[PDB]
Amino acid sequence: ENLYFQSMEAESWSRIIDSKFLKQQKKDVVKRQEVIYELMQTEFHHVRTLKIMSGVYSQGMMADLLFEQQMVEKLFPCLDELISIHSQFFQRILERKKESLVDKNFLIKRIGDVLVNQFSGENAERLKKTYGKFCGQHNQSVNYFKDLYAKDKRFQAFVKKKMSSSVVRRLGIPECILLVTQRITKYPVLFQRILQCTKDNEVEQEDLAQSLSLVKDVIGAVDSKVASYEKKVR
């Protein structure tokens, strides 16, 4: 789905965190809705970061500097895939908000099934391969970027032009790569905060516990892949 539409759905969600409707629910509900918000908002930022990497930097290198498709895969491996995964994950979350209206005021009573789906079966396998690759090529790409900046004056001009743009916050390529690398390790924390906020709901508590166990398996797999890559690079 479209990024502006995604941002409007996010901005809409956040209006309800500030609302009097929410602030006048029970403390445990306010806290639970506040943590589920955090998961959504940070997933939106992740998707935004990825699409800036792709639409601004990656597309710009090919269009302006005549980089090949392969030189860009060196800097940003599996970027198209990541964008697909996280936009879709982000959609599922919004789709859940849309069916959680009350009596425009909503209250997410159930998000565990969405998380379990995302981190099991072939979705989990896609994340493992995707991040294992991105997180493995991680340090080579940052060095490759820094190598290019110091050497190629045309890339140097390109980067300064981009950082000045209103589109990129002041997101440098190194920062982008670093943010994307971290992301997968954020989920256990966000998921576990939702779980400990969830009271008197058995289905949800079970699914959240499951998703938390599941995302740790993915992280493990990614860490094995990264370790092996680095050993091979030497």
Residue numbers in the entry: 1968 to 2070, 2074 to 2204
Task: Give excerpts from the publication.
To investigate whether for our constructs the AKAP-Lbc PH domain contributes to catalysis of nucleotide exchange on RhoA we cloned an expression construct containing just the DH domain (residues 1976–2211, terminating at the end of αI) for comparison with the combined DH–PH domain. To analyse conformational changes in the DH domain on binding we crystallized the DH domain alone in the absence of RhoA, revealing a significant movement of the GEF switch region, which adopts an α-helical conformation with Trp1980 itself binding in a different pocket on the first DH domain α-helix. This we refer to as the inactive conformation, in which the position occupied by Trp1980 in the active conformation is now occupied by Ile1984 and Ile1983. In this inactive conformation, the critical Glu2001 can no longer bind to RhoA. We cannot rule out that the inactive α-helical conformation is induced by the N-terminal protein tag which is at the start of this α-helix. However, we note that the region around Trp1980 is weakly predicted to be α-helical by the PsiPred server, suggesting that a conformational exchange in and out of an α-helix induced by the absence or presence of RhoA is a realistic model. In contrast with AKAP-Lbc, in the structure of p115-RhoGEF in the absence of RhoA, the GEF switch maintains an active conformation.
AKAP-Lbc (also known as AKAP13) is a member of the A-kinase-anchoring proteins. AKAP-Lbc exists as at least three splice variants, however, all contain a conserved RhoGEF (Rho GTPase guanine-nucleotide-exchange factor) domain. RhoGEF domains decrease the affinity of a Rho GTPase for GDP so that GTP, present in higher concentrations in the cell, can bind. RhoGEF domains are composed of a DH (Dbl-homologous) domain followed by a PH (pleckstrin homology) domain.
